[PDB]
Design a protein around this ligand. Structure first.
Ligand SMILES: Nc1cccc2c1CN([C@H]1CCC(=O)NC1=O)C2=O
Ligand SMILES: [Zn+2]
Lengths: 370, 1091
């Protein structure tokens, strides 16, 4: 069994403690148009609910967020369709929750912890003199639907509420979707669109990654649950954007299950054919899931996936604990044996009593589900 | 896009029912909720008396009666699904009946998640308040004008059922609630003066894990009865009584009713159709009924079974059990088409005449329903007597009250038939002539018989048969036209008219006149409280073309209507429908004029024209089920009847009828002698209504239906429930269609505790008999069914789309496409194509077969080797449940209204995604209207229409129609039940049994009718005072947008029903081009013809 504290990564300790905490929450109305600033050096995609750690040191980015704290505390994160040509039609708002100003080495520097809130549709990307952009965006509403059966049952059969509990799930289908008999579809079809059902089908793989998972931690709400799960799936940008367009939690879970089932082997994006790891090696070393966004000392955000065994990797240099994202572990650069592509790191425990004694931190940009 | 939506057949399914004294504190009433409809009744003790039938602008969710303190009768509370609350009072004054809104408002909360176990509408026994559980964690209270409401924060979120407790000084509610720890019963006291809740009279006692219903039991008992899966518990603080009968273990009790007003006897009802009696604790099984949605005890032993899955009932609760041991006997069965899960339009019987066969009902109530537009005749005798020019019934025996003689008229000839029971014989009536054509004959005054011929007027005595009197025109001229009742005769001799009275052994010439022109037709029918003596003579004339009301005996003109035209009136008739007097005048061209007649003044008002046949119509009166009717004989035989003091015309399903008369003989009771060009038929008339419904019980669930003309049979997918037996298989619950097949067969496998068995049934298009039944594989779920010819092959095959369903599998990993040939009364299996998924839908595509295997859309080619060959595959990322086609363009549909248009490229042999839409909402059905438009059924009982320069513009669909239907559509179908103003016709089948019609309109016609709708709404009084515009507003938990691109046919049709001064109000400044009231009558008349 794993003894490592799965809460440690989620709290971004490497960023330092003693950060200004903000409680107050801002939420914009649905379909409303808003003008939100964009951070010039963020190139990652943020999912609602996902934590985004930042380490800003460019004077314009520093002044931007410094002024942001005085008001809204929200900024826009764009889902780039073409990162080189900086093209983005979608994005998510990020609200700052932890903040810290330091002055060092002749510069004014700031560290933030932000969280994804609301998805949006880009209308126009206007640019400012200082270099930082502004985005006229339209908030996309989260579309919540009732039970498939809600409409068909306005009757007496309505008052039928929701190992060994395998039969419970069949009795559940039999009971909940009994009124499918009034329709042109069977109860087993309706289950493919049931939020509770689709969640259990996902939770089935979430327990295969988190062996020591307590259901108390997991969100009951399908909206939060669909998003949490999206943020920890090691998939390409094209596929992540497609998931960000999704308005319904149902459509999302269905999409996520489809991905989860087709997901087999993870390759080197550069080689395309060199296999580095498999779905079976994936494990949740953090409560956020197997994958999370972390910042290096130069503000570069690496969404890293934790796996027990990796394969065509070669290491270089000696382990280091300096700025480690998993306290108690030392990192060492790992690259593709074939092409030399930076794949991530090998994390090795600094104490004999730690479980796991080693794991791999693979960056999702280096990977290809091919 | 502009569309028109109208009800072809109202909802049939019973949503709820109650008993009380609504009409009067004397009369026992039964109120039935058929969704948007309210049926009000009186318990006749010798039947069920229908008083009034009102329609509402909402789906009924709550319906409970109440009498608060000093009231003349009962007040009805109605709550719609859109939270329209209202109090309705009954108001009668003579012939006028009106529902009166006593209080009305909308109780919807600005926010809130509608609860899981639906809307609960309970009333305090003392009529102190209205309790509503619409949202989880709140309790809405309406104290019993604008229906003022307030909420009370309820701590226990998940409430199962609740009732208002009896015998309380302070109002109390008892509810079953569920929390993670368990499911427990609780009590709360509701205070109006404190506007909050206070602790209940007794403790939160723990109940059964599956405790479903709370039964409010009256004094001297008090407290509550909690019904569960196996247990029936009772709670009253310290008083507790827990019974667990094994007889209720099989099915869950879904509905109850109170038999004794004190609370000693209750009628319980389970999901399988069993009827229980809870005695005060002891439970006794009475017998089996239809699957009851609701139960009502009324009068002495009679029970109303309010069913939604099958035909509603009237049943007797005898204290004496029969041989089988049942204390339940079936009195009357009320047709319920709902749910319609599938349907198709077929040209059965006659071509051009559309008939609608539906997969209706569920489980044991499963049936096929054949809906044919028009009344039918049940033939009992057929005689070869060509060229009959007239028919008349007679009673040769004055002592006998029934007809024993039938007199036939021919070209210058008369024959007489005697009815010796079922035996018809050629005979001669003494006194009557055979050598002259007859214009009239029948039983007359002073126990005599009359015969009017082209020559004379002969009066014949009945004891014995002999000639008593004989009238002739002075110059021996021929009688042209003739009218006779019982004591009076008016005959024409060209322009001349003669009035004679029928006295004992005497035909008395009272008066005579000359007319302006030649007489074409005559009528002297006595109307009102006129004892066989008519003071009016209705007459049609040649050349001037007029209908004239003359006075008897003076012959003085009272009114003269100028019919207009060159075509002369052929038939004229004075009649009485629903106590209202009318004049009916048929023309040679087939046109029928109808007016209301004043018996005193003789004034013809409200002139209405109706086109019947191409031939001159002959009007004969007949009594059907103690009601006067008019049979209109032409090449389109019609019945002219009354409904809500408006004349209705429904076609008779007969090629042509020339002459008819009613015959009540010992062998043919309450019958109709009908004659055409070749034969005389004696038979009985069906129910006088617009549509006819033939019920073919299957005793199992019909799911899908299609037709094969080349086989003269229907292919039907049906499933039966079977329980797991103590053997390596299953056993049936009762015999049903699939078990009782003429020839039976089973699928042979090649692919790698209550069970659902799937079958393909083969039913003959006439008899409707199960010729064959092909049972599918174990765990095989049949989904789609299509009858077509594919590739170069000239044989029509029945194709079935299956899915291998297992409880562990979520998405079916296996499935088949099975090709069957129906020849020699057996299904020959041509091809068994195994696919890696569920075959949700299939369609014939320009000579190929398009099918959907889960999320993929496959195109199959039918080779010479007679095997479907995979051509091109479109991978959609959306499950392809809906698959519809028109030419080379395909429509793909997801349950979440995710539509995508495909197009097969003939030269490329691939699929091209034209346009896509992704607006999450539950979608139940979808149809292609035309090349650019397509109709669908969206969540919260709504309808919608999606329509088709830049690439971004053309690749995205536009929602052009939004409409709240109030019904859950399961099937769309291109067809019509009727033998240009509008474009196309799509019929739709709903869950409640409602059938509807959707057609297309022009920009101008749409706006004309939309303007008219707003105007009609300013006149028309709404039950519960609900705004029409609100009721039709597109509605979901989120957005409530007003209706667009849709015209409510049901509202537009009620223009022909409003008062003429109100029509004038509606048409005033309507329109630019001006709009005449007579123009808008023609437009609206034209639109009523589509259905
Ligand atoms: N020291 C240094 C210099 C330049 C880039 C980077 C680093 C350390 N690092 C990662 C190593 C893995 C970790 O757990 N935390 C980090 O911060 C980088 O990406
Ligand atoms: Zn590589």
């Amino acid at each position: 069994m794993i003894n490592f504290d799965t809460s440690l990564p989620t709290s971004h300790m490497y960023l330092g403690s003693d950060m200004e905490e903000f409680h107050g929450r801002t939420l914009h109305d649905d379909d409303s148009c808003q003008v939100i600033p964009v951070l010039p050096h963020v190139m990652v995609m943020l999912i609602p609910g996902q934590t985004l750690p930042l380490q800003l040191f460019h004077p314009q980015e520093v002044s931007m967020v410094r002024n942001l704290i005085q008001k809204d505390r929200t900024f826009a994160v764009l889902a780039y369709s073409n990162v080189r040509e900086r093209e983005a039609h979608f994005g998510t708002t990020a609200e700052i929750y932890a903040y810290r100003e330091e002055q060092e080495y002749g510069i004014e520097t700031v560290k933030v912890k932000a969280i994804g809130r609301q998805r949006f549709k880009v209308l126009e990307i206007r640019t400012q003199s200082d270099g930082i952009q502004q985005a006229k965006v339209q908030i996309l509403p989260e579309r919540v639907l009732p039970s498939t059966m809600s409409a068909v049952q306005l009757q007496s059969l309505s008052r039928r509420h929701i190992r060994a509990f395998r039969q419970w799930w069949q009795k559940y289908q039999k009971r909940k979707f009994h009124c499918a008999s009034l329709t042109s579809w069977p109860p087993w079809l309706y289950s493919l669109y049931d939020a509770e059902t689709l969640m259990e089908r996902v939770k089935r793989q979430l327990h295969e990654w988190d062996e020591n998972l307590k259901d108390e931690s997991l969100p009951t709400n399908p909206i939060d649950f669909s998003y949490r799960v999206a943020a920890c799936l090691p998939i390409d940008d094209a596929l992540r954007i497609q998931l960000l367009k999704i308005g319904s939690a149902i459509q999302r879970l269905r999409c996520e299950l489809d991905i989860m089932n087709k997901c087999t082997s993870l390759c080197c994006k550069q080689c395309q054919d060199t296999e580095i790891t498999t779905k079976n090696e994936i494990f949740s070393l953090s409560l956020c899931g197997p994958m999370a966004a972390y910042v290096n000392p130069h503000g570069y955000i690496h969404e890293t996936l934790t796996v027990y065994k990796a394969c065509n990797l070669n290491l270089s240099g000696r382990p280091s604990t300096e700025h480690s994202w998993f306290p108690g572990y030392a990192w060492t650069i790992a690259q593709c044996r074939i092409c030399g592509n930076h794949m991530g790191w090998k994390f090795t425990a600094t104490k004999k009593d730690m479980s796991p004694q080693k794991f791999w931190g693979l960056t999702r940009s280096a990977l290809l589900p091919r | 896009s502009y569309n028109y939506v109208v009800t072809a057949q109202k909802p049939t399914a019973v949503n709820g029912c109650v008993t009380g004294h609504f009409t009067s504190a004397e009369d026992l009433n039964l109120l039935i909720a058929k969704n948007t409809r309210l049926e009000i009744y009186v318990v006749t003790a010798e039947g069920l008396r229908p008083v009034k039938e009102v329609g509402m602008y909402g789906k009924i969710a709550v319906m409970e009666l109440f009498r608060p303190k000093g009231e003349s009768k009962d007040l009805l509370f109605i709550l719609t699904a859109k939270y329209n609350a209202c109090i309705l009072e009954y108001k009668q004054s003579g012939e006028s009946i009106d529902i009166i809104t006593r209080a009305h408002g909308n109780v919807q909360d600005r926010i809130g998640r509608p609860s899981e176990t639906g809307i609960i509408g309970i009333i305090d026994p003392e009529c102190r308040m209205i309790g509503l559980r619409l949202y989880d964690g709140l309790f809405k209270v309406i104290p019993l004008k604008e229906l003022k409401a307030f909420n009370i924060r309820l701590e226990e979120l998940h409430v199962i059922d609740v009732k208002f407790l009896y015998g309380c000084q302070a109002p109390t509610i008892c509810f079953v609630y569920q929390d993670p720890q368990g499911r427990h019963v609780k009590t709360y006291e509701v205070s109006l003066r404190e506007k909050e809740f206070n602790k209940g009279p007794w403790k939160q006692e723990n109940v059964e894990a599956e405790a479903s219903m709370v039964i409010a039991v009256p004094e001297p008992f008090g407290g509550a009865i909690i019904i569960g899966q196996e247990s029936i518990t009772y709670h009253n603080g310290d008083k507790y009584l827990a019974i667990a009968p094994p007889i209720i273990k099989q099915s869950t009790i879904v509905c109850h009713n109170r038999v004794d007003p004190n609370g000693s006897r209750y009628l319980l009802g389970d999901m399988e159709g069993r009827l229980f009696m809870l005695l005060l604790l002891r439970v006794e099984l009475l017998g089996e009924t239809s699957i009851a949605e609701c139960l009502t005890y009324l009068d002495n032993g009679v029970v109303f079974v309010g069913s939604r899955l099958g035909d509603s009932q009237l049943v007797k609760l005898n204290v004496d059990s029969n041989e089988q041991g049942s204390y339940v006997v079936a009195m009357e069965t009320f047709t319920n088409l709902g749910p319609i899960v599938d349907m198709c339009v077929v040209d059965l019987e006659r071509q051009g005449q559309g008939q609608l066969v539906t997969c209706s009902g569920a489980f044991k109530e499963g049936s096929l329903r054949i809906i044919r537009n028009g009344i039918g005749i049940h033939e009992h005798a057929s005689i070869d007597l060509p060229g009959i020019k007239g028919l008349w019934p007679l009673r040769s025996d004055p002592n006998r009250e029934t007809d024993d003689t039938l007199v036939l008229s021919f070209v210058g000839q008369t024959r007489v038939l005697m009815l010796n029971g079922e035996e018809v014989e050629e005979t001669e009536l003494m006194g009557f002539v055979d050598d002259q054509q007859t214009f009239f004959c029948g039983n007359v005054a002073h126990q005599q018989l009359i015969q009017i011929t082209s020559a004379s007027v002969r009066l014949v005595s009945q004891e014995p048969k002999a000639l008593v009197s004989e009238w002739k025109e002075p110059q021996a001229k021929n009688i042209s036209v003739a009218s006779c009742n019982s004591s009076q005769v008016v005959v024409a001799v060209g322009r001349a008219l003669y009035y004679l009275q029928i006295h004992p052994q005497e035909l008395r010439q009272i008066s005579h006149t000359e007319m302006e022109h030649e007489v074409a037709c005559l009528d002297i029918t006595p109307l009102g409280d006129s004892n066989g003596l008519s003071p009016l003579c209705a007459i049609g004339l040649w050349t001037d073309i007029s209908a004239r009301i003359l006075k008897l005996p003076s012959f003085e003109l009272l009114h003269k209507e100028m019919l207009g035209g060159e075509i002369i009136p052929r038939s004229i008739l004075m009649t009485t429908f629903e106590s209202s007097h009318y004049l009916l005048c048929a023309l040679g061209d087939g046109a029928l004029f109808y007016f209301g007649l004043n018996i005193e003044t003789g004034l013809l008002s409200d002139r209405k024209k109706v086109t019947l046949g191409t031939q001159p119509t002959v009007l004969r009166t007949f009594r059907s089920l103690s009601t006067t009717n008019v049979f209109a004989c032409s090449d389109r035989p019609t019945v002219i009847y009354s409904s809500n003091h408006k004349l209705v015309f429904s076609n008779v399903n007969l090629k042509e009828v020339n002459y008819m008369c009613p015959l009540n003989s010992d062998g043919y009771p309450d019958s109709l002698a009908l004659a055409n060009n070749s034969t005389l038929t004696i038979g009985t008339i069906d129910e006088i209504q617009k549509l006819h419904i033939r019920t073919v019980p299957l005793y199992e669930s019909p799911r899908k239906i299609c037709y094969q003309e080349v086989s003269q049979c229907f292919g039907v997918l049906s499933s039966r429930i079977e329980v797991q037996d103590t053997s390596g298989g299953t056993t049936a619950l009762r015999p049903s269609a699939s078990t009782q097949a003429l020839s039976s067969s089973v699928s042979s496998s090649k692919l790698f505790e209550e069970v659902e068995v799937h079958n393909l049934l083969i039913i003959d298009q006439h008899t409707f008999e199960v010729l064959h039944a092909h049972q599918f594989l174990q765990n095989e779920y049949a989904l789609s069914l299509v009858s077509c010819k594919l590739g170069k092959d000239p044989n029509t095959y029945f194709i079935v789309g299956t899915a291998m369903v297992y409880p562990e599998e979520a998405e079916p990993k296996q499935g088949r496409i099975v090709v069957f040939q129906y020849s020699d009364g057996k299904l020959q299996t041509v091809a068994e194509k195994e696919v890696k998924g569920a075959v949700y839908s299939m369609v014939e595509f320009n000579g190929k077969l398009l099918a959907s295997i889960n999320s993929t859309v496959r195109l199959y080619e039918w080779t010479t080797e007679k095997e479907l060959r995979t051509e091109c595959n479109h991978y959609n990322n959306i499950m392809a449940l809906y698959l519809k086609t028109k030419g080379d363009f395909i429509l793909v549909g997801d349950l979440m209204r995710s539509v995508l248009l495909l197009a097969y490229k003939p030269m490329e042999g691939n699929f091209e995604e034209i346009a896509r839409d992704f607006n999450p909402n539950w979608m139940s059905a979808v149809e292609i209207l035309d090349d650019d438009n397509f109709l669908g059924a969206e969540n919260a009982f709504n309808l919608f229409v999606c329509q088709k320069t830049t690439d971004e513009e053309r690749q995205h669909l536009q929602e052009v129609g939004l409409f709240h239907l109030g019904e859950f559509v399961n099937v769309f179908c291109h067809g019509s039940l009727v033998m240009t103003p509008t474009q196309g016709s799509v019929l739709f089948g709903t869950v409640n049994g409602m059938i509807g019609l959707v057609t297309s309109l022009s920009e101008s016609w749409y706006n004309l009718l939309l303007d008219m709708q707003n105007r009609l709404n300013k006149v028309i009084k709404s039950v519960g005072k609900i705004e029409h515009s609100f009721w039709r507003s597109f509605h979901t938990e989120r957005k409530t947008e007003p209706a667009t691109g849709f015209i409510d046919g049901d509202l537009i049709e009620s223009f022909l029903d409003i008062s003429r001064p109100k029509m004038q109000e509606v048409v005033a400044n309507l329109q630019k081009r001006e709009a005449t009231a007579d123009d808008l009558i023609k437009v609206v008349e034209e639109l009523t013809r589509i259905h």
